[PDB]
Symmetry: D2
Subunit: 367 residues, 4 copies
């Protein structure tokens, strides 16, 4: 049967799921038109309902989750709500596509997994960077020993939306809503290390609060509780030595994720800000013609082919949500997929909590 979609939340991530569900089939072709049934948010739900192309609206989400025409729930609400909703969804016997993270506290996340395992439907997280075709091609080259045995790995995630110290204090500075850089940014690069290598094993963290306080929109000032920057030395699966840097106050970085991989027979460079390329170095051939090759995303780097039949033309950030949507449908029928499950996400969040502890206790921490 064609899949019946319930979406909760309509902020950017809601829009992006919606665009994804509305497009998988036309792009990919090998599945059943999803049907956009129910949507939740004030009764602006009826307004957005028009925009995104959903049959029903409501401002009760437990009702969406109740609705028997919905098979799949897209949770894209704020962090605090994920646990509550994903669980009510699972319990009501449905599949879950949930935005990162799972929950800000480990035992909540535990509960989410316990449910899901116990549940019957699948449960995925929106770690979309993973789905870039360039990135699947990176995994393949690495897997195939193209650069030999990976010794060292560097990974940077930077933006500058906290750089300006005069923006009003909001939830992204409350410890109880997240650690900061770690919660918000580090999970992506770890999701990448996961996809490519595996989980993290020991960590030690230095963290930065660049600004002691920030104005309140209703007057006065509040202490920043959180950390907008984190630098982590690590060890992954297989004893690979890795450095992670995440920074939310990095002026002039917009959407940067920079990944450098070093092996005994070569190297790889990648940078999200030029999403559609990567650079590959092979210690292979005449020495006077060695160097990194700049390789442009092409139909051979599947599934770029489903989007465009010409190389070097480019996918966009939203294109990555469509592929993730596709892979979610694979799971539903698994069918082998490349998704991140609550099982692996929880494990990822385990590494996050370790990093914070790692900083407060000022010591290496094993996991």
């Amino acid at each position: 049967k064609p899949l019946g979609i319930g979406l909760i939340g309509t902020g950017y991530m809601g829009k992006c799921h919606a665009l994804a569900w509305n497009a998988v089939k036309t792009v990919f072709g090998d599945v059943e038109r999803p049907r956009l049934v129910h949507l939740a948010e004030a009764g602006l739900a009826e307004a957005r309902a028009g925009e995104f192309g959903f049959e029903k609206a409501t401002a009760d989400w437990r009702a969406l989750i109740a609705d028997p025409e919905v098979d799949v729930v897209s949770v894209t609400t704020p962090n605090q709500f994920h646990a509550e909703m994903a669980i009510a969804a699972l319990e009501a016997g449905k599949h879950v596509w949930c935005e990162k993270p799972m929950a800000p506290a480990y035992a909540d996340a535990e509960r989410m997994l316990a449910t899901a395992e116990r549940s019957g439907k699948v449960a995925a997280l929106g770690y979309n960077y993973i789905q870039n075709p360039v990135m699947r091609h990176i995994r393949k080259l690495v897997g195939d020993g193209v650069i030999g045995r990976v010794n060292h790995v560097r990974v940077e995630m930077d933006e500058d939306f906290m750089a300006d110290p005069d923006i009003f204090f909001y939830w992204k500075s409350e410890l109880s809503a997240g650690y900061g850089a770690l919660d918000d940014f580090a999970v992506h690069p770890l999701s990448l290390l996961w996809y490519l290598f595996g989980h993290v094993e020991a960590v030690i963290t230095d963290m930065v609060k660049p600004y002691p306080d920030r104005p309140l929109s209703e007057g006065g000032r509040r202490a920043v509780e959180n950390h907008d920057a984190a630098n982590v030395l690590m060890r992954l699966d297989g004893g690979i030595s890795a450095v992670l840097m995440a920074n939310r106050a990095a002026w002039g970085r917009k959407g940067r994720i920079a990944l450098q991989i070093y092996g005994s027979k070569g190297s790889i460079l990648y940078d999200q800000e030029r999403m559609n390329e990567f650079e590959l170095y092979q210690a292979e051939g005449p020495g006077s013609e060695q160097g990194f090759r700049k390789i442009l995303a092409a139909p051979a780097h599947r599934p770029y082919d489903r989007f465009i039949p010409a190389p070097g033309h480019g996918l966009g950030f939203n294109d990555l949500k469509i592929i993730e949507c596709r892979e979610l449908i694979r799971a539903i029928t698994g069918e082998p997929s490349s998704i991140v499950t609550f099982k692996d996400g929880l494990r990822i969040e385990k590494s996050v909590h370790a990093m914070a502890q790692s900083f407060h206790e000022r010591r290496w921490i094993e996991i």
Copy 2:
């Protein structure tokens, strides 16, 4: 009144039209959801429409121009059939969204013009590179006098799909079916120059036939009648001196459109291979700190914000079609839009014919 859509062509460009029509509403929010009515193809039709979410599949393409429920005709087929099909839609009172070129010869185009100019409807060509938030933004800066008065401009469009000399001869290689690099490629840089600057006044072309012939699919060899590279010196509206290079045999160039613009107070560089950025130099401020600024597409460069709300994240090539499709809709209600009309498309194909002439004649030519 929500538009009923009619689409001919299932190639990797008809796909683009369907993606576009499917997506506009969700992205932009401020139009009625276009209805997917009629799809035309061989025998594949039935399945294709399954994929592109259409209502009725048929192999008859006049049955399409018939269906009273069709308002817009998307013409996405081989270059030869363009004319006849646009005309049968225009005369039959349907709006036209047509892929370039209008047609191989000036007078079938001249016809197309008058057919539509006399008809009620709107006719648009698919010059999509025009629609980049980045491109829109370069227009504004030029406009605002940020770089001063513009004197010089270079534009290069390169791919390498005709680069391998040992690929079997096909229609791309017949003079019958186009000049080659000129009609296939130079047109895009022309719409770009038309968009920022105006139409071309004086040309002079050199042309290149890299490989005198090619092997034949069923044994032997035909000569190549075409030219896979042109280089053109030019004058435009108010004597902007430009140079234009087109080349389908440029190894390594995958999707390259490179534009440099120079004025009395600065310069602008742009590259389609890094489509979501450009470089701006302003002769301003201490000289110990001037240089090109790498500006990354962001929400402030409309209509990027209708796609993602964070900078540095990237639109793909397909998003260009969604924007175009929005502009066409604007035109139909229209309301001034930024679309290329047949009227202006012609004056471009004018330029291009003059281009091929100034070669064959070995002298300057005027327009």
Copy 3:
């Protein structure tokens, strides 16, 4: 026998000649240490020689061509005095290392040729971009058929020292003293094309006068007789189709010579602003990994190894002069060298005069 050196000119180019002569031995190891004998200038001479470690300072420049102890004459002065001075050195039996251009008019150059061709000595022009280990290496790869047969070539030389329209009119702006962008700039790209490919066969130029006049240093305004930008379509030895762009009014371009070369099996890109690298594309190996390789100058690209023994470290622009100076010495003992002789310099200035002609005449021109 160690050469006694004679140098006329103390500008920022005579400096270069002295740096060179001072350095060659230590760098290359395999020549005799050139002796700094005679320096020519105004009244500064005495001090200048103090700086450039010379023996005898004089304001008489014939006294120089006299000194029996002088073997090589370095001519580094304003373009006008070049001819007379090269000739008085050639006829007086001295070797000549002369800065470009030979001279503003074809026949003073034609003279220079015969003067030297009849004389015993060696005469070299300072086309130094030729001498880059990178450039030498591109020659070899082209030679080895790494990119196949070369059909197309673009070359851009840009600076922006004539970019500010409000800089006081000076000699750079008189037709009297040169065509402007053509003699000042296009010559370098010509030596480059001569070095890899050969001499130019057919030209056709467009020229640009960005600013109709300039203010005068002591009040008022003169018209600009010159042209600060030329764009030239061309044919070379065996119909390599080339394009060449020169422009002294290109804001942001500081020291830019950009060369793209395209052949049947690959391409080469190069940029003088990143002088110690280039990019090579080979159509070879799995297509999921082709792209431009960024090769960084290294010891294997002679004679880089005579400067630093580690890759990626960089030669400066001044090192180009040291290499040239070594080649001139090679020529004098000579022994085949890679130097530009008057004989070949002329055929370049030929090209350039033809270049300026094909504009004024508004038609193609042959050589």
Copy 4:
């Protein structure tokens, strides 16, 4: 009096001092021709003595150090020898220009300083990266609050001369000859953090031995004792949070030093492999035109002006030794200079020893 130079060692670093001493005056102009007097190394010393332009040779260095015509000793021999020689030099009442490092053991270095302080002449180390004009301009922008208060700093030093696991074992793998990456590479980036900010205060280090063993040239295999890679979290002067990564087996890095600096009002990027540029981001101006500016080395970035009067043309690695030579002469007469003294070098090496300890003791270490 003009300064009298004694050089010990003739391997690359010897050549580079020699070229520096031979050129300072012609480049800079404001000092006294140094005189190249004595040189030490087998009696190949007489061969190199010709090449570099030194009056006397010998294979006894205690004799060079004895020689009363020598005022300055250039020590450029291998690491182990530095202590012995620099001290014998100082004691014999002479100035010292010594290659990094000081000694592989802290108390040896202590002794070197004790001497020097006690001595009468100056004592400098060859931390040349510091002298790049781009780098002096970085310091200036930072000093002048151009990017606000620096919060975070990243610094990478990579090469690939240990990447190939089949190169024979030599001293660079003996613990008693150095830690590896830390000894050889980390001192440069720390020298940079020193120049820009100051000394290091707490550190914690992860270290990589990518290869357990390596062949012996005379047959068999030996355990690698050392570490070819080091990742260090740190805190500098002022509580600035810094990450340092040094790697000698990083395939495709040739001469990379990558520095990223992040402040509350902007950012700076620099990369040694394009030595002649840096990128500067200013949170200053309209938001739709922000981004990093690529600024090319220019006469305004003193003392680029003493090398070339045109921007964007480039200095080379050797050019940096000439400037360091110049600054050494300033010191001799201090006269304010920008040199690194034994006092600051020892302090730098203190941080190195801390980093190693830091790794073996698996804990943060304060300094």
